[PDB]
């Protein structure tokens, strides 16, 4: 067998089927001879292509197969890698290399120290010292990716590789199972559980690796049975919770005197699958209150590492949580009261509110829809305005970077057919990835997205304003038309001017047979 | 004096003037209170951001500074970044840090690694230890990007230390001369000179630093001198020659074997300003021929060390193409003659030949156009097709990265107003950068940009014949109303369906105000 | 040909005769049919068969070729790496690797990720991706440590490469002439002859790069052209000057105020061949008082973008040095004026200042004796007490590393054979590389070791001292015996308690025919 018969093979054993690429001349030794039973998923520039796989791999709750071209895609794509880094996203990103009798002279497409160029956003990056070990490395990537703390990892493979015999002693990767499903041994889970079934006044934070280990139902009876308040993390990558469940809480706010002012009073503060903290404004003040204790079970040994406060345990989300929700006593205690809906602002017959937006989408959408936020300067609300009842209804770039939510709202409705995607995109961040767009055109992923248009950047105008920064320049940005752009990549597109135009285009964009973009005139 | 202001003292003193960026919280510190008497060129995406930049240093001859958003706005320029290492670009890529305060913890916004980010496409990359090293650092940063062989840096900035108070002792940076402006000595290019004057069959070989030196007029009088046909290196991303003067030969095949071959009967081949060399397809022979030697002339070490074959200097490109200029002999051999005209390519009245186009801008264009190409299936006729007397009248993307034309050609206009500038994009790479497009129209820089719409990756479907290469899939891109898409970017749009309309097209679009994109229909 | 016998002859085609070795099976095959023109040396550690090879390198001013062992055997050697980066020592490192077979399962003695591993103190650092690319990697690795700034380079080569075919085309390496011997431009050249040439109160400061190049006379012509004092820029790897030349002034302290207090007064100060500077204690001030311009000469694009004042040019110190020295006029001024003898220091019949060793080395050592300093508390004596005549007399661990003297001192006098070198080497310095004394035992390499024995980390306790630190741990070294450890690799030995021991001692040393240790009991 040749190495690109094997490497297709293990692919395909390990469970992979489908590859997000942008292709280019180090990948055709690859990509030629496709195999019938995988789907190639091609996106315009590999901000896209990942970002769609990203979208794909945590919707999914698997690893997703990316090929890109050489030195300048990956580069297009690290970015993209930014934020999979930060959601423990399993990437496996594979990017074509010159010829081996090219790569000394440094040949046009000439991946140039590859092994170091997605540093530090990978787990594992690689190149094979000969073509029969590219299977072998193959293996590593797939298997680097899936195990906790999940995350990208990267591999060059030379182009001449693929055509060269393969090992047949590779037959022994296809089938390899390994698993990092594991929990606190039994005596130390016993005192875990005791301090909770101990605690006078305990709460829950809740992070995004509950969402991808489908773990929230299980998060949902440990809440229950502590009779515990449950927040959501700060900087939130995903929703782990029902958020009109009676114990949510909402959003953390991302800095350290209010998250301590937050807890102050609770005895005992359990987090699950988040950072310690990921805050982000500077509010300097203690970490923790007086009289809290905090435990964090995180999947991520560079979590707990870092946390400036409490004890940890790394290991799996799933396996912990449910131990947990199976082990502690129901409380006596009261079941926490639901928070009240928040507050109609205020909508006259013009711009609209964000608000608005979200209370409106909130009203007509489905009840297992899936949001992806990169409305920057509207987060709070949309998190206060959304009944998200399900798993998987929640996205938002988790390093902060721009030009993750179009391309992953794409991978999301690939990975969710049934589910219908609402991305909800400013202005300012639309633009960073907007060629994704057409991918969902070709494909028919009928994803919708609501651009909301204030002509600005919004939450760096308002941060200005915070530092009482004058004179900034680059903040705005005008005269952008989306309906065009959409037209551009072949997406149908609606302007709503007002709410009697924002319902009329939602209703038209749900009944739709394919991807639609409204683009919205917000305050 | 605070760090903010002494930073900007040092670059206004070092001949800074223009900051390209897109803007992020970390940078605030540093954006606010912005000099009256700089620029800022904001672009949406910031692989726009360094593209134009790239194009802003390659036709300015001088370093061009970049401001980005942490690890995600580098990341997303990592793929121009790849470029701007293959053309020598001196680039000052700074990058807005989280506060000192918040970076243990890996708060939002974090640039995790921050030095090792960029690498290995950069030749020096750093985080300064202290705020009040900041200017130090970028003085440095300043420096290493400017001396030959130039190219890009980069500096991370934690944002609180722009109001931290300087060292006054930084006043010593302001006006530092920083000179790598050498050539030979005397002994050793008295031997180089014998050598050149006493060859029977001389050869010339240009690449991309004669035109970044403005070496080009010497190489004209050194080839006139020596009675030598000239060739430019193979990949090129500039122009080095008058594309008509009697002694061109064109672009160089990026083969092997080819290279030889046209090399053969040559007894001293003088290469200057090139690698040895920007090969690309697999094309395997001999390096050289028996009874050619080869002679380098390089600004970059290891350009140098990489060579396969020939001898080296390593030195600055203007100063040994004046020195050698003015040194050679006045052979007594017959001047070269100049290549003849191309064909041209019979056309009916429906979709444009790419040759034809390449006539049509020839025939219409100024004489002092700038061009750039990132039609990679037509670039040989490109070359042979432009008459292009003056330095810096093209540009191709150095590393093969797609997304550099379109938004370099924007920098490029910036750099010389009164030079038009004509960015003839294919229609799969002009989706790569598309945003950039907003920056021409919000900043009315009148670039104009070509469409070359033939519907498919061009270049890979002709190199997948050339492998026999069945059933890979990505390789088309129906669906792009490119019209559209300039609408959107707020830039004037045209079409061109047949000879009639792209010269109609043409017209109005030589006359126009502003930037104007022409979609073409080609075969 | 093989891998291997192309290797070999590109080595010797290059000048490369020896090798500097500790032995493995990764590198067996390598070694193997070893040819009979090629010298092995062996030294039982890595840091000291990188010591040797670079005292010999920096003496012979060549690249010297080292073979190592995997990961462990490049890690022991980089301390040495380290002080080889900072002396711009032209060191090939090649490290076996695991056969390609191997490497990824990461068997026993494979290398990881091999090229980060001696980052960041090499200019290069490659594995070949096949076995036909191994002779080119040697070509770059051959032209990076030779090139201008000279410096450490590394190379990883699996085992099974060498066996293999080479590439027929490989015979265009052999010959390759690689030149940076570059000086400015002349119109840049004569505008700072002239700013030398109208200079009122010149000073010219010379670095180590200036006895690497050989310059060292062609800067006595200079100093005695300009009437110009002459100092030796701190932290001083290597003797650029006379040390007894009227103009000479001596080693510069290594700090900020005291250098810009030093040079007060001095309109123009010159450096060459230095950083500007290698500053190490913290003494805070002015980097030059008003009134002084400094104008630096440096091989090192690196050291040119750090220094926090002056002009600079970047060229090969070799050519600037000779070109200035014979275009600067005849100053009319007064030649500078000798520096005066040291005082002889009160020494009674019991153990010796170090300031006595110094004296009684310069009454009794030949005139072409070459020093090395690893006696970290007595430097400064030490460079008023030794007249130095001629270039290549003395050197320092550039880099502050321990470890480097006594190997180095081995390499210079196998390097040359007709001076006698004589280390002077601290009793702390001295553990560090001990087992390098058996290379010069078996090989019959005539060096000199003087040990310098007060007990203690002297220049550690002294900097306690100045701190005022208190209860500082681990300062003391006592009960080592020298002469028990020369005895054990096979050296003979002798000790000094007193004066009279320690003349009968260097005259037994300097007629001995092998190498010598004396243990000198000093204060
Ligand atoms: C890749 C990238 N570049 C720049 C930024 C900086 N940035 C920018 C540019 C923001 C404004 C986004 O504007 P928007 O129109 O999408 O939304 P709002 O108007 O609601 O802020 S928020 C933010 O952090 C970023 N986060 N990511
Ligand atoms: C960033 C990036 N991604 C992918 C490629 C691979 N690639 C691709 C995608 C090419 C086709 C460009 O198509 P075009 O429409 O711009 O021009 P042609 O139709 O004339 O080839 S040429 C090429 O090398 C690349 N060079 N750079
Ligand atoms: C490899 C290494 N380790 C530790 C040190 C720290 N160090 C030490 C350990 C010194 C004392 C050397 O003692 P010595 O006996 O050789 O000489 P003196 O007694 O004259 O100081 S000087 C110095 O910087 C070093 N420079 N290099
Ligand atoms: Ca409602
Ligand atoms: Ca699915
Ligand atoms: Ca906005
Ligand atoms: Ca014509
Ligand atoms: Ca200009
Ligand atoms: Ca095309
Ligand atoms: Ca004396
Ligand atoms: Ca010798
Ligand atoms: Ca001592
Ligand atoms: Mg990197
Ligand atoms: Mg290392």
């Given amino acids: 067998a040749s190495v690109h018969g094997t490497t297709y093979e293990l692919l395909r054993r390990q469970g992979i089927d489908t590859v997000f690429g942008n292709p280019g001349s180090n990948q055709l030794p690859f990509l030629k001879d496709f195999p019938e039973d995988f789907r190639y998923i091609l996106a315009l520039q590999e901000a896209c292509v990942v970002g769609i796989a990203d979208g794909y791999a945590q919707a999914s709750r698997k690893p997703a197969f990316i090929n890109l ?12 890698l930014s934020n999979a880094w930060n959601s423990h996203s399993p990437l496996i990103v594979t990017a074509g290399q010159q010829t081996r009798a090219m790569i000394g002279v440094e040949a046009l497409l000439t991946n ?20 029969a070990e590219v299977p072998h490395a193959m293996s590593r990537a797939i298997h680097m990716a899936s195990m906790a703390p999940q995350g990208p990892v990267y591999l ?29 041994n039994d005596q130390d889970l016993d005192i875990l559980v005791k301090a909770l079934n101990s605690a006078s006044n ?32 700060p900087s939130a990558p995903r929703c782990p919770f029902p958020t009109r469940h009676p114990c949510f809480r909402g959003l953390m706010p991302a800095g350290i005197a209010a998250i301590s002012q937050l807890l102050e009073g609770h005895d005992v503060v359990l987090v699950i699958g988040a950072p310690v903290f990921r805050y982000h404004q500077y509010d300097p003040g203690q970490y923790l209150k007086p009289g809290t204790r905090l435990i964090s079970v995180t999947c991520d040994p560079l979590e707990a590492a870092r946390a400036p406060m409490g004890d940890a345990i790394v290991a799996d989300i799933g396996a912990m949580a449910s131990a947990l929700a199976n082990l502690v006593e129901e409380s006596s205690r009261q079941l926490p009261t639901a928070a009240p809906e928040p507050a109609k602002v205020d909508q006259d017959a013009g711009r609209l509110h964000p608000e608005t937006v979200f209370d409106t989408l909130n009203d007509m959408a489905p009840e297992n829809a899936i949001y992806l936020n990169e409305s920057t300067s509207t987060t709070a ?5 959304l009944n998200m009842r ?20 794409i991978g999301v409705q690939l990975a969710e057919p049934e589910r ?50 004058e004179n900034v320049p680059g903040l705005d940005v005008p005269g952008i038309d989306f309906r065009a752009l959409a ?27 394919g991807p639609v973009l409204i683009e919205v005139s917000t305050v």
Wanted: some cysteine; glycine content about 8%; hydrophobic content about 45%.
């Fill in 69 to 80: 071209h050489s030195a300048a895609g990956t580069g297009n794509a690290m970015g993209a």
């Fill in 487 to 513: 037209k551009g990549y072949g997406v149908q597109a609606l302007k709503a001017d007002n709410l009697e135009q924002l319902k009329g285009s939602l209703q038209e964009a749900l009944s739709a047979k």
């Fill in 390 to 409: 399900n798993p998987g209804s929640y996205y938002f770039c988790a390093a902060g970077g721009l030009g993750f939510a179009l391309p992953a709202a």
């Fill in 420 to 469: 219908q995607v609402i991305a909800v995109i400013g202005d300012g961040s639309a633009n960073y990835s907007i060629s994704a767009l057409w991918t969902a055109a070709q494909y028919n992923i009928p994803t919708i997205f609501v651009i909301m248009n204030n002509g600005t950047y919004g939450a760096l105008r308002w941060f200005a304003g915070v530092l009482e920064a």
């Fill in 202 to 233: 305990p709460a829950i934070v809740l992070g995004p690796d509950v969402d991808a280990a489908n773990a929230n139902a299980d998060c949902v009876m440990l809440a229950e049975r502590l009779k515990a308040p449950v927040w959501v993390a």
């Fill in 156 to 184: 060059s493979v030379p182009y001449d590789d693929w055509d060269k015999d393969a090992d047949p002693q590779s037959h022994h990767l296809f089938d390899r199972h390994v698993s990092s499903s594991v929990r606190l």
């Fill in 381 to 385: 609300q949309m998190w206060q305005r």
């Fill in 112 to 131: 140039v120290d590859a092994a170091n160029l997605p540093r530090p956003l990978v787990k594992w990056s690689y190149e094979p010292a000969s073509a």
